[PDB]
Amino acid sequence: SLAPLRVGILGFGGLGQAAARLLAPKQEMKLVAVADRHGYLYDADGIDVDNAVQAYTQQGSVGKAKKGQMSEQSIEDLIGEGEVDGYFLALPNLPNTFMADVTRQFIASGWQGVLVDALKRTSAVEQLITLREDLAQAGITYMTGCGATPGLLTAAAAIASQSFQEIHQVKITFGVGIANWEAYRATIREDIAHMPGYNVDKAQAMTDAEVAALLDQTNGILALEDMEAADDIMLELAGICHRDQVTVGGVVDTRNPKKPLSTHVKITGRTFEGKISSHTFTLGDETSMAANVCGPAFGYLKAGYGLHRQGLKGLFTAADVMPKFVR
Amino acid sequence: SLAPLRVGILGFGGLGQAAARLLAPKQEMKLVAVADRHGYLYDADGIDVDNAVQAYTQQGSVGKAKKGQMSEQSIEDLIGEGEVDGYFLALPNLPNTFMADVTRQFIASGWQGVLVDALKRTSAVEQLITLREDLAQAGITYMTGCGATPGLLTAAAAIASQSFQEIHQVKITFGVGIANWEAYRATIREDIAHMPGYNVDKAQAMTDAEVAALLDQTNGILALEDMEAADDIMLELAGICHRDQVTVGGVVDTRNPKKPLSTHVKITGRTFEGKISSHTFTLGDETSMAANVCGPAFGYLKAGYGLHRQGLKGLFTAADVMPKFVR
Numbered sequence: 001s002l003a004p005l006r007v008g009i010l011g012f013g014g015l016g017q018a019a020a021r022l023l024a025p026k027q028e029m030k031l032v033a034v035a036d037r038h039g040y041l042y043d044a045d046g047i048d049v050d051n052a053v054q055a056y057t058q059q060g061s062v063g064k065a066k067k068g069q070m071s072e073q074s075i076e077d078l079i080g081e082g083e084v085d086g087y088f089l090a091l092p093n094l095p096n097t098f099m100a101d102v103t104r105q106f107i108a109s110g111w112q113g114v115l116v117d118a119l120k121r122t123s124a125v126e127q128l129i130t131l132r133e134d135l136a137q138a139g140i141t142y143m144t145g146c147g148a149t150p151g152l153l154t155a156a157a158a159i160a161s162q163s164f165q166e167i168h169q170v171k172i173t174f175g176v177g178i179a180n181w182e183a184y185r186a187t188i189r190e191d192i193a194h195m196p197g198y199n200v201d202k203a204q205a206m207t208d209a210e211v212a213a214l215l216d217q218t219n220g221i222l223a224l225e226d227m228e229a230a231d232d233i234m235l236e237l238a239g240i241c242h243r244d245q246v247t248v249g250g251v252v253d254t255r256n257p258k259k260p261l262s263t264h265v266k267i268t269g270r271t272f273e274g275k276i277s278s279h280t281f282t283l284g285d286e287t288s289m290a291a292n293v294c295g296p297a298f299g300y301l302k303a304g305y306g307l308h309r310q311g312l313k314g315l316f317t318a319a320d321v322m323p324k325f326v327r
Numbered sequence: 328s329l330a331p332l333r334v335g336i337l338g339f340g341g342l343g344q345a346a347a348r349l350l351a352p353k354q355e356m357k358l359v360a361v362a363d364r365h366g367y368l369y370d371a372d373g374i375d376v377d378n379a380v381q382a383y384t385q386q387g388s389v390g391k392a393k394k395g396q397m398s399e400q401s402i403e404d405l406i407g408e409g410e411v412d413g414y415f416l417a418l419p420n421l422p423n424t425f426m427a428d429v430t431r432q433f434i435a436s437g438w439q440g441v442l443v444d445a446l447k448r449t450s451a452v453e454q455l456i457t458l459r460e461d462l463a464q465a466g467i468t469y470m471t472g473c474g475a476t477p478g479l480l481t482a483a484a485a486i487a488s489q490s491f492q493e494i495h496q497v498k499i500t501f502g503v504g505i506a507n508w509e510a511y512r513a514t515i516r517e518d519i520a521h522m523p524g525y526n527v528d529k530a531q532a533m534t535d536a537e538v539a540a541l542l543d544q545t546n547g548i549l550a551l552e553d554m555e556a557a558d559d560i561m562l563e564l565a566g567i568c569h570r571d572q573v574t575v576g577g578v579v580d581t582r583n584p585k586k587p588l589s590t591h592v593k594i595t596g597r598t599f600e601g602k603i604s605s606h607t608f609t610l611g612d613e614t615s616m617a618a619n620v621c622g623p624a625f626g627y628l629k630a631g632y633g634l635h636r637q638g639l640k641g642l643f644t645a646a647d648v649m650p651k652f653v654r
């Protein structure tokens with residue numbers, strides 16, 4: 001609180017903006033750094049989040065904020081300009097190697113400290129796993145899949161698993177209600193890619209005409225099933241179950257702020273007594289995606305710094321470490 | 328699996344017996360050591376659990392098992408006789424300093440490795456907190472309150488807390504159905520001590536006449552409220568909330584194996600968006616007390632060994648560390 005963790009956010013779409021708002025009341029964490037594609041903002045005294053959001057939404061980049069710098073190498077620039085202890089990578093993984101490529105930038109820069117992502121797709125977390133020794137040698141402590149799911153729900157399953165001799169199934173069912181289309185339309189193609197007959201390339205190339213066309217066919221509801229979702233490999237690496245016993249689905253209602261169903265994870269297994277049973281972890285319907293992604297993300301950044309300060313570098317998942325409550 | 332964790336159990340009432348049964352199918356953990364008040368059993372090749380339970384239930388001590396040694400200093404003897412990497416302290420805290428006194432024995436012996444308890448009462452965990460430097464200097468890694476509650480539910484609350492700016496309440500409600508009076512009547516006074524107008528001294532002095540008298544007044548139901556329960560100090564030490572915002576209650580049905588209500592923990596707080604909401608973690612009704620106490624206990628022993636192998640000694644609670652799934 002005399003010595004808060006100095007943190008940055010890379011990416012300032014809806015998620016990074018929400019992360020900035022979440023950090024505002026924190027005593028022991030201070031936002032000093034934001035970057036987007038076209039500009040960055042450093043302030044060792046703490047970001048003016050109102051000014052950064054104005055700049056981004058009104059002028060298209062935080063580079064246009066007071067103290068903002070326009071730059072086409074915004075991330076390269078920001079890394080070198082300021083004392084930052086940990087970054088939240090609130091970047092869409094677009095192209096599908098970008099998170100790994102931003103991370104390769106961090107490795108290349110000679111910067112050390114904590115990185116946290118809220119990656120979703122198994123194949124994305126697999127690219128970060130390939131970098132675990134590169135990260136370790138660099139002196140980076142990297143927390144992967146530390147959002148809502150993967151993240152919060154993955155940790156809940158890892159704890160719930162302790163009652164069982166054998167895990168049979170981990171089933172994640174999420175709900176999202178969109179309150180502000182503005183701070184979502186940037187990322188809707190990420191969700192549509194999981195729709196039947198879609199892939200990341202097909203979703204990303206869609207026009208708003210095609211998006212509105214698709215959404216009108218279901219009153220703005222995206223019912224997603226058997227998603228490529230890194231909870232599977234994270235629980236597998238944690239020794240809890242095989243990735244094939246993990247299934248992720250959910251509902252995003254693009255036309256209602258109200259969560260369309262209660263986010264939960266159900267962990268089914270057999271106990272040492274041979275009894276088959278299930279634990280369920282259910283999220284409150286008034287906890288938003290932002291709260292359930294960004295809250296854990298900074299809890300893992302804080303846990304990560306704890307690991308970093310004890311000399312433990314490399315790659316950790318949300319299934320591997322207990323997140324620390326941030327005040 | 329070529330090199331399993333060699334573990335012991337101190338105390339062989341219903342809980343220690345259940346812990347022995349839980350370890351039986353494990354590949355990467357091997358039970359080598361049991362002790363009770365009047366005898367001990369060491370076997371580096373792995374305990375015959377059938378023989379140990381026969382001896383205990385039939386002859387009143389594992390000292391009477393094959394390879395068993397009768398001894399009135401059973402714990403002092405066992406510690407010195409065998410290579411054991413971690414012990415589960417499945418001892419009733421009777422008298423109320425016994426767990427701390429057994430732990431002072433471990434500190435005095437020069438033995439190092441992992442200890443785990445399933446203590447319940449705040450004041451008991453407070454006695455272990457006083458010993459944290461003694462433990463560290465001794466080279467012991469001590470995992471306290473690593474049962475069902477405290478333990479599993481405490482870790483669930485620590486994870487659930489990450490969605491919130493401020494915690495308002497953590498409410499734990501547990502159910503226990505007693506299947507076998509035999510493996511419970513030894514510990515029923517532990518639960519009765521939490522009944523209205525009772526304390527530990529009054530409960531412990533009760534005759535079976537007085538117990539049966541009390542139980543007949545409620546068809547064998549013990550409805551317990553605002554218990555002295557270490558989940559409060561564990562979540563406080565974890566920086567999550569004040570101990571006064573933690574409340575523990577539940578129901579033990581002494582006359583039915585069926586769990587009388589679903590064990591759950593409800594975490595209420597305010598999100599960064601100012602919204603009040605609750606997460607709920609609910610246990611399966613066919614997960615027994617044994618599974619939900621002993622499963623986590625060995626998950627924390629395994630996590631503890633991981634901490635020990637990286638040179639981290641002293642005192643950890645279930646709120647502080649992610650338990651590791653034991654195969």
Ligand SMILES: *[C@H](CCCCCC(=O)O)[C@H](C)N
Binds near residue numbers: 175191263287292293
């Ligand atoms: C990513 C998943 C969001 C999880 C929402 C959980 C909740 O807040 O209850 C979306 C689908 N892009």
Ligand SMILES: *[C@H](CCCCCC(=O)O)[C@H](C)N
Binds near residue numbers: 476517
């Ligand atoms: C200790 C508490 C047991 C917790 C039971 C939880 C469950 O298995 O659902 C007892 C009251 N002695």
